[PDB]
Structure 1
């Protein structure tokens, strides 16, 4: 969070938090209620987002669910929708945290090493979370869709 980042930077230089850094915590705590509502909206509409994002993902990339692909079969396709559920769960942490550190530490650090070993196409995984972004943001308002979308974009960029 911004509170954690402000303390780490302040502790590094051996000093108390500056008036500017304290102000970054002041607005963070005031706008905390806003981000919790955004997190709840995605949490309530969790099953719908994963299903629709999957349907759009397999439409754009049929080779993954076709014979020879990584997500071929009911079990392999169901496991792919769980990956989407994981990153959707990480996005909700990223939103409520106010930064992309929870998303980074958990499901992004060494993400290509995982999928290359599994044999999963990571650009296909990146295209999957693109589908979640559009389905998730459509539920949220115009202002909230812009805020929540920046966390999805970070997950897309890390995979690319």
Structure 2
């Protein structure tokens, strides 16, 4: 964050670098777009989740938890997008591969997640900038289940 960047600059007795400034400038300026994205994923959260669950419907034994988890995945994506901090996804998906490996099916989860991503993207057809943001964050989520 800003307070982060400032702390290290201070630590090194210096002005923020041109790069640090540009990076913060871009973080603030993409803010409106990131909020637009979150508002949209949120209001459509239920349709996005049910599309993902449906795609693996026949693989699911625990539908209540499946629907819950898929909603939670999308909710943390949504946090990360609002904060402009992909690490929110990383911290909160820590260890989930093992847990869901064991709980149901790793294969299926990735299938559902890919549908979370596709269904999410579907709301930004006209808006390449947003689609990129959405794909970047969704890819961070999925990758935490791949390698």
| TM-score, normalised relative to structure 1 | 0.78
Equivalent pair of 1:28/1:98 in contact (CA under 8 Å): yes
Structure 1 residues 84 and 15 mapped into 2: Cα distance closer, same or farther (>3 Å)?
Answer: farther
Is 1:159 the counterpart of 2:145? The answer is yes
Residue segments in structure 1 that go unaligned for 5+ positions in a row: 66-71
5 Å-filtered alignment, 1:1-160, equals 1=1, 3=2, 6-7=5-6, 10=8, 14-16=12-14, 17-58=16-57, 62=58, 64-65=59-60, 72=61, 76-106=62-92, 108-116=93-101, 118-140=102-124, 141-143=126-128, 144-160=130-146
Number of positions where the alignment pairs a residue of Structure 1 with one of Structure 2: 143
Cα-to-partner distance string for 1:34-71 (whole Å, 9 max, x where unaligned): 1100110001111111111111122xxx3x23xxxxxx
- Which position in structure 2 is the counterpart of 1:69? none
Which range moves more in the overlay, 83-92 or 27-36? 27-36
| TM-score, normalised relative to structure 2 | 0.85
Cα-to-partner distance string for 1:7-31 (whole Å, 9 max, x where unaligned): 57x2696344323202211121111
Cα offset, 1:110, TM superposition = 1.5
Rounded to whole Å, the distance in 2 between the matches of 1:46 and 1:34 is 18
Cα-to-partner distance string for 1:69-96 (whole Å, 9 max, x where unaligned): xxx2xxx112101110001001111111
Rounded to whole Å, the distance in 2 between the matches of 1:47 and 1:83 is 12
Cα-to-partner distance string for 1:135-157 (whole Å, 9 max, x where unaligned): 11111234112210111111111
Residue segments in structure 2 that go unaligned for 5+ positions in a row: none
Rounded to whole Å, the distance in 1 between the matches of 2:136 and 2:56 is 20
